[PDB]
Amino acid sequence: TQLTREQVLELFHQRSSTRYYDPAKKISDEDFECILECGRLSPSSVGSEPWKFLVIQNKTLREKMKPFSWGMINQLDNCSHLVVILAKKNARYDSPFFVDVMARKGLNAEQQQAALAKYKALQEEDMKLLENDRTLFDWCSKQTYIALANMLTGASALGIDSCPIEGFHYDKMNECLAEEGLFDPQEYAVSVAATFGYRSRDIAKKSRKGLDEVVRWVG
Amino acid sequence: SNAMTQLTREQVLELFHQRSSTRYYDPAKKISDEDFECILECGRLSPSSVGSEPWKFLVIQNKTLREKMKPFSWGMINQLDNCSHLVVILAKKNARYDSPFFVDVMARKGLNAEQQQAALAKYKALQEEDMKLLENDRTLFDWCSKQTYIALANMLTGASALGIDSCPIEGFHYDKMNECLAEEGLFDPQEYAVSVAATFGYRSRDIAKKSRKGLDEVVRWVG
Ligand SMILES: Cc1cc2nc3c(=O)[nH]c(=O)nc-3n(C[C@H](O)[C@H](O)[C@H](O)COP(=O)(O)O)c2cc1C
Ligand SMILES: Cc1cc2nc3c(=O)[nH]c(=O)nc-3n(C[C@H](O)[C@H](O)[C@H](O)COP(=O)(O)O)c2cc1C
Ligand SMILES: [Ca+2]
Ligand SMILES: [Cl-]
Ligand SMILES: [Cl-]
Ligand SMILES: [K+]
Ligand SMILES: [K+]
């Protein structure tokens, strides 16, 4: 339940992005389901959970992605698990996507009319997401980076290495995966990827800006 | 074991499951300076695309500034009175591969001149071709904004691990939030813009149990 400050900082300091995986070490089914749960339990704006997790274990599909996946060229051949996270397309307040969102919350008829009003104000005016489809997509995509973070941190807490991945051609990745029937490309598009496994070598800790530079205190 | 505590599967899940979005804070319970520093470090230490760390954390403790945000901050109107700490995360505007921002990124990594040139080529391909972030100013800002949701996520989890309640916040008027904070002189409006906020403190009331889509619904296994 509760950690000390030391335990929290040892966790976040020791987690590095791992590019060199031991191809002979596999994550147990039990450990990998725990990582997926960390993603599933993530918070999201208005409880939208606008994500899907493709676990790409197929070695033939891993090979096919390599030519346009320069960010994980080595990792695709050596990592235990690969997750491609999709974000919901056209998640408009007035879409059936939000019928499901409200159902899950158990809102009555009048509670739903109020919720639709709130969702519209958020999307149209407050955040101005309804400028174009890409701006609305990028909103769900941001939610999926919460899921990404939780999966990275959870894996690290279990003693499992990981790497978040943006280093691929998104258009060709979208075509590649949609052509495999892995999702409806009218409903979802690729957001971000992540590899999981066990380092093949020591991974040097990487630099950060100072807390003084990152934080502006407004007392 | 080692210098590091090794958590069980059950303890790791506990940490994510026990984190609920808190809207009702005890106004008499304040987060210690030390615990809140820890929370901020979880944000600082977050991963980011190409080590860009394109975030800035405004810690808004000023009660006059908090009350000024209320009229256009309907998603945390009551939290603004009762929460211990408030963090507004900015994302870098116009983080182009050729920008002074990326000179600083490469300077932190200790790249010599030849491997700076190779990094520039990588940044350029990612922004221009792979992710097509240079469509307009907003697509480029939204890429930095996505990095800041990792920092957000890790600060909620850090708070959770320390026994501290939190709420991620999007429920405010962004143009008005930007105007309010920039007119206060808290950042350069051409350099940064508001990405997302979060409240921190202690529950005054028992908060709702999780409602999520099943693992069956969200996971497609490709064996
Ligand atoms: C959204 C995201 C995408 C990333 N994409 C890649 C990638 O494609 N290839 C890679 O080798 N590292 C990738 N990284 C890892 C970052 O380079 C890394 O987080 C950064 O260099 C800081 O190092 P550290 O995470 O080990 O502390 C990515 C990180 C993030 C957050
Ligand atoms: C980016 C983001 C913004 C959110 N903004 C608000 C907010 O403005 N007000 C609020 O009460 N909750 C807000 N939430 C909390 C969500 O409603 C909550 O995460 C979701 O309903 C799931 O509930 P849980 O976090 O308690 O599991 C936000 C969540 C996220 C991830
Ligand atoms: Ca220790
Ligand atoms: Cl690689
Ligand atoms: Cl509130
Ligand atoms: K969307
Ligand atoms: K930017």
Side-chain angles (χ1 to χ4, degrees):
Chain A
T1 317
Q2 211 179 351
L3 303 189
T4 69
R5 287 184 298 271
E6 166 169 335
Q7 286 171 312
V8 172
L9 294 185
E10 284 187 326
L11 177 52
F12 282 111
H13 273 281
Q14 95 204 30
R15 184 225 56 93
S16 276
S17 292
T18 293
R19 292 163 184 97
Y20 312 100
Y21 289 110
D22 189 342
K25 291 169 142 178
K26 304 303 174 177
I27 307 169
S28 65
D29 290 345
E30 296 87 312
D31 278 339
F32 193 67
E33 291 275 292
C34 179
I35 291 169
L36 289 171
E37 282 293 334
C38 291
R40 188 180 74 87
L41 288 172
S42 300
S44 58
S45 189
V46 300
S48 58
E49 305 165 52
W51 45 62
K52 189 172 262 286
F53 308 142
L54 302 178
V55 187
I56 309 286
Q57 295 311 87
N58 188 278
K59 286 174 181 272
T60 296
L61 179 47
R62 283 196 185 179
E63 194 72 14
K64 185 212 282 207
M65 287 178 286
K66 279 211 266 159
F68 55 77
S69 300
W70 52 267
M72 52 172 163
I73 179 59
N74 292 341
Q75 297 177 47
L76 278 169
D77 282 335
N78 298 299
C79 76
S80 178
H81 289 66
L82 168 61
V83 180
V84 179
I85 309 167
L86 311 183
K88 191 69 191 67
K89 294 172 95 306
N90 202 23
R92 261 185 145 259
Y93 64 92
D94 64 354
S95 71
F97 176 73
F98 266 107
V99 171
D100 264 319
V101 169
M102 289 179 309
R104 220 151 53 239
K105 287 194 196 163
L107 300 184
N108 65 32
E110 42 265 54
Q111 281 182 306
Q112 290 167 33
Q113 291 317 112
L116 275 172
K118 184 192 82 181
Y119 300 158
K120 182 167 190 260
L122 181 65
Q123 293 189 327
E124 184 187 3
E125 185 56 38
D126 293 318
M127 313 197 52
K128 292 180 178 67
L129 299 186
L130 305 183
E131 177 170 37
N132 63 55
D133 299 340
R134 178 151 188 191
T135 56
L136 188 46
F137 174 72
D138 281 342
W139 178 58
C140 299
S141 180
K142 289 167 191 196
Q143 315 308 314
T144 69
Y145 277 62
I146 304 175
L148 172 70
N150 289 348
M151 289 198 281
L152 290 186
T153 297
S156 199
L158 288 180
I160 302 171
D161 292 305
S162 59
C163 195
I165 300 294
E166 269 180 10
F168 54 86
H169 202 276
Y170 271 70
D171 279 0
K172 292 155 88 171
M173 180 68 83
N174 276 299
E175 191 85 287
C176 178
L177 294 185
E179 286 298 297
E180 288 282 20
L182 296 182
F183 66 92
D184 183 344
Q186 290 306 284
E187 298 299 335
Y188 287 93
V190 171
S191 186
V192 66
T195 63
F196 304 85
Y198 295 100
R199 63 187 54 204
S200 59
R201 40 160 294 193
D202 201 4
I203 309 298
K205 161 187 268 292
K206 301 308 191 298
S207 67
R208 293 294 188 286
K209 288 178 284 194
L211 192 60
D212 65 327
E213 203 190 334
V214 175
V215 179
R216 169 81 176 253
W217 202 276
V218 194
Chain B
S1 164
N2 82 318
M4 267 65 148
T5 304
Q6 287 189 168
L7 296 189
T8 66
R9 260 178 301 267
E10 288 73 18
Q11 290 174 319
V12 167
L13 256 164
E14 251 168 23
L15 172 51
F16 292 96
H17 198 272
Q18 75 195 353
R19 185 224 51 87
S20 285
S21 294
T22 303
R23 288 90 181 198
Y24 299 108
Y25 289 108
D26 190 331
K29 293 187 186 190
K30 303 310 190 176
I31 306 169
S32 78
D33 302 329
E34 297 82 354
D35 276 343
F36 194 71
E37 183 145 318
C38 194
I39 291 173
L40 291 171
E41 288 280 51
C42 299
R44 189 173 73 88
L45 291 180
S46 284
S48 61
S49 184
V50 302
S52 56
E53 314 161 49
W55 43 65
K56 184 81 167 195
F57 312 147
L58 305 182
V59 182
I60 313 294
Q61 297 306 101
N62 188 278
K63 268 158 148 257
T64 287
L65 183 45
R66 289 192 181 186
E67 71 178 18
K68 186 173 179 231
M69 298 172 162
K70 285 179 146 289
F72 54 83
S73 294
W74 51 268
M76 53 162 169
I77 183 144
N78 277 294
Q79 298 177 45
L80 279 173
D81 283 321
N82 286 49
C83 75
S84 172
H85 290 67
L86 171 66
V87 178
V88 178
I89 313 167
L90 315 179
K92 188 78 189 54
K93 289 177 53 171
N94 201 42
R96 202 161 184 271
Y97 63 86
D98 68 333
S99 76
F101 176 75
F102 268 105
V103 172
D104 281 317
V105 175
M106 299 193 259
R108 287 201 300 283
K109 289 184 195 160
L111 300 189
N112 66 42
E114 78 194 351
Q115 55 182 179
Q116 282 179 36
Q117 222 62 25
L120 280 165
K122 275 329 205 170
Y123 306 155
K124 182 155 191 292
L126 184 73
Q127 295 195 334
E128 277 188 350
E129 182 61 24
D130 293 306
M131 306 195 66
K132 302 197 208 307
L133 301 179
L134 304 188
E135 184 176 321
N136 56 65
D137 290 341
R138 187 159 192 172
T139 56
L140 191 44
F141 171 76
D142 276 346
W143 171 62
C144 292
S145 178
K146 293 172 186 189
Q147 317 311 310
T148 73
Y149 279 60
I150 306 170
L152 174 71
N154 287 324
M155 286 193 284
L156 305 181
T157 299
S160 181
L162 294 175
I164 299 170
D165 296 303
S166 57
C167 199
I169 307 296
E170 270 180 7
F172 60 83
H173 198 291
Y174 270 66
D175 290 339
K176 295 195 191 158
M177 187 58 79
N178 276 303
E179 291 199 333
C180 182
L181 294 178
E183 287 185 342
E184 225 66 20
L186 291 181
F187 66 90
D188 191 337
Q190 58 217 283
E191 289 291 318
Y192 287 95
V194 170
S195 183
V196 68
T199 63
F200 300 90
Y202 297 97
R203 277 155 46 199
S204 67
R205 300 154 46 159
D206 190 51
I207 304 291
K209 75 164 299 306
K210 257 63 207 304
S211 178
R212 291 299 185 283
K213 275 182 287 192
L215 213 51
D216 268 8
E217 188 168 358
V218 301
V219 178
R220 175 78 156 76
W221 202 281
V222 184

